[PDB]
Amino acid sequence: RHLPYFCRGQVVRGFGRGSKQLGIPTANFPEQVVDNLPADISTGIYYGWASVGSGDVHKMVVSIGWNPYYKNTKKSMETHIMHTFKEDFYGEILNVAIVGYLRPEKNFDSLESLISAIQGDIEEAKKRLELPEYLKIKEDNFFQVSK
Numbered sequence: 001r002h003l004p005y006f007c008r009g010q011v012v013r014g015f016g017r018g019s020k021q022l023g024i025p026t027a028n029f030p031e032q033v034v035d036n037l038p039a040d041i042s043t044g045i046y047y048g049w050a051s052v053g054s055g056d057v058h059k060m061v062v063s064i065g066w067n068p069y070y071k072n073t074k075k076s077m078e079t080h081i082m083h084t085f086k087e088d089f090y091g092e093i094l095n096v097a098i099v100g101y102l103r104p105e106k107n108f109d110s111l112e113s114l115i116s117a118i119q120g121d122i123e124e125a126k127k128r129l130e131l132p133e134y135l136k137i138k139e140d141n142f143f144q145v146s147k
């Protein structure tokens with residue numbers, strides 16, 4: 001209902017061990033950005049398009065979850081871009097267009113099942129983003145302003 005959702009934010013570090021350890025880096029936005037999501041953007045896994053600073057637009061998956069740590073029930077958001085970056089981009093602006101919903105959050109009983117799930121979400125996102133209604137969002141002026 002609030003898709004496609006467009007937002008931009010500084011890329012910031014997270015806590016615990018980064019998902020770089022899984023070969024699947026996940027970029028965070030400051031709390032200010034996540035707080036401005038409409039409530040109807042429920043938790044779960046979404047897919048869409050992203051660029052960093054003035055770079056090209058690439059396919060991405062976003063995880064929207066509950067934060068265990070802040071007062072009230074604050075959400076969290078983290079984006080994995082399906083593009084190999086030559087270096088990190090902390091502090092740069094990540095521009096995102098969230099275009100579709102993949103699945104609700106799920107509980108997994110091992111890292112094996114978690115990693116397999118994430119890889120499957122990525123492969124499914126790549127397929128869904130080829131649909132003409134989603135492929136066109138790559139060309140949105142939203143992304144053209146950043147170049």
Ligand SMILES: Cc1cc2nc3c(=O)[nH]c(=O)nc-3n(C[C@H](O)[C@H](O)[C@H](O)COP(=O)(O)O)c2cc1C
Pocket residue numbers: 014015016017018019020024025026045061062063078080104105106107108114118121122
């Ligand atoms: C596409 C995608 C889907 C995810 N799905 C789930 C999920 O269904 N359930 C869950 O508990 N964690 C899920 N995660 C969580 C990541 O494994 C977790 O947030 C990890 O700690 C990344 O944060 P980090 O940068 O601190 O490592 C998902 C992550 C991604 C990228």
Ligand SMILES: Nc1ncnc2c1ncn2[C@@H]1O[C@H](COP(=O)(O)OP(=O)(O)O)[C@@H](O)[C@H]1O
Pocket residue numbers: 011012013014015017018019020021024025026027028079080081082083084085087088089090
């Ligand atoms: N494909 C990519 N998608 C998301 N982040 C990437 C990607 N390639 C490199 N990065 C870098 O990885 C960082 C995320 O790594 P991660 O291990 O998840 O740590 P953290 O969540 O604490 O920032 C991003 O802030 C960014 O600088």
Ligand SMILES: [Mg+2]
Pocket residue numbers: 014018019020025026027028078
């Ligand atoms: Mg991360």
